Amino acid sequence: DFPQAWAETGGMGLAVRQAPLIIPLKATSTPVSIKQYPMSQEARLGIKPHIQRLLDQGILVPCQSPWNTPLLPVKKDYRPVQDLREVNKRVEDIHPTVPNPYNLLSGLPPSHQWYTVLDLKDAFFCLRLHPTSQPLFAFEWRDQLTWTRLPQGFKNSPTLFDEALHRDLADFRIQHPDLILLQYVDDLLLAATSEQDCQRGTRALLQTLGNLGYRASAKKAQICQKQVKYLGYLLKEGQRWLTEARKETVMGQPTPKTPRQLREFLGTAGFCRLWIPGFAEMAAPLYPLTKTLFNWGPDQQKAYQEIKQALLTAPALGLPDLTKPFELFVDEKQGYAKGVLTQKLGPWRRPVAYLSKKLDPVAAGWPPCLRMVAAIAVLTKDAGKLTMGQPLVILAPHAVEALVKQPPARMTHYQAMLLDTDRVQFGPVVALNPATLLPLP
RNA sequence: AACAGAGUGCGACACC
DNA sequence: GGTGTCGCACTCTG
């Protein structure tokens, strides 16, 4: 039905509006041959059929180059990645344009709740390399070659491709303004308001992409769904849920017995902190067991449990509405700041994110009252990363508006941040649910 | 043994 | 007590 745009059918891609790239070198560089690292029978055999599939496909061509860098295949078959730090250090740097994965969804309007997701197959290869630059990307072989397209391992590949595709799509975006199109480099979210208003765009877009010369995986496609996985998340109805996959990777593991094992834990669980109320404080007992003896007392096990429990009971987050205002409820506890950034849908405050930070050494040194102010300060700063300086009412269990206006060091800076009334208004003192951190009637 | 971007915790150097 | 630059963990997205 759409043979052109499906990699599985319409064959390898080529960004047609995109003219072959010429990679600008450092003003002082020099070709570098580098000994093809040894791999193994499984690695050599892993990317073996790939280096052969690409060859007769033109993407790969017989070459004789000063430069050699060793290819570094991977897996999850194998990827034809290529270890080339030596090259891309001899290559100049460019002002980047890759999206901020943190706030991309901030731009998904609740009006739009019909979703499609298209992952792009072999995106980088859709860009052509200009024969001048082709040699930089050479590697030995047996059964020396090089890339006619844009290879993985190359430091600019990510940005170069974002721009290419972003530019190629700037057309669409103005022409179907009734649709939303988020783009994280390689893969795309389309948002409609209607089951068919989605199936239009998903026809148009899916077409445009075939024309422009890009191809999308029909395997990984997610067409006109009411919920979709995107960026590690489940999106459904303008809310962001943690994936059961994500959870299993924590629940599943055995209680850490080394610092390394602890670090992996805090590592992956910390990627869920937006869904864990008073996270930072929760994990306080765990942190010192990194770097340092490893005594696993009750507090360690308490934290450990609490955190895992907090994942099972984890709530959906509301996607930030930038056309509305936000409230930030905040509390401070023994040197730890915690709070929930919320927005209203009718009669409901619905959390947009949970924010917590360990109070730094000096702050932590100040008395309870002052601590609350610093608590309010950091979380406000962090909330900014989501609100985009949209107007924010700050609420808390202890009144502090006065003190930030009439204190008897850092204040100067805190006052500056908190007393800009064009973005920050204190609200009334309120009582919070100790869990959920929401206000009590 | 590769890249870009992101989250958070810890340290080091320097500076009044 | 305050304040500026780095580096090293673990983790995630593609």
Curated annotation (Swiss-Prot):
Gene: gag-pol
Complete-protein stretch covered: 685 to 1144 of 1733
Annotated cofactor note: Binds 2 magnesium ions for reverse transcriptase polymerase activity. Binds 2 Mn(2+)/Mg(2+) ions for ribonuclease H (RNase H) activity. Shows 4- to 6-fold increased rates of cleavage in the presence of Mn(2+) versus Mg2(2+).
Annotated Mg(2+) 1 binding sites: 119, 186-187
UniProt-recorded name of the protein: Reverse transcriptase/ribonuclease H p80
Domain Reverse transcriptase: 55-235
Binding, DNA: 246, 260, 263, 271, 366, 410
Additional remark text: The reverse transcriptase is an error-prone enzyme that lacks a proof-reading function. High mutations rate is a direct consequence of this characteristic. RT also displays frequent template switching leading to high recombination rate. Recombination mostly occurs between homologous regions of the two copackaged RNA genomes. If these two RNA molecules derive from different viral strains, reverse transcription will give rise to highly recombinated proviral DNAs.
Job of this protein: Multifunctional enzyme that converts the viral dimeric RNA genome into dsDNA in the cytoplasm, shortly after virus entry into the cell. This enzyme displays a DNA polymerase activity that can copy either DNA or RNA templates, and a ribonuclease H (RNase H) activity that cleaves the RNA strand of RNA-DNA heteroduplexes in a partially processive 3' to 5' endonucleasic mode. Conversion of viral genomic RNA into dsDNA requires many steps. A tRNA binds to the primer-binding site (PBS) situated at the 5' end of the viral RNA.
Catalytic activity: DNA(n) + a 2'-deoxyribonucleoside 5'-triphosphate = DNA(n+1) + diphosphate
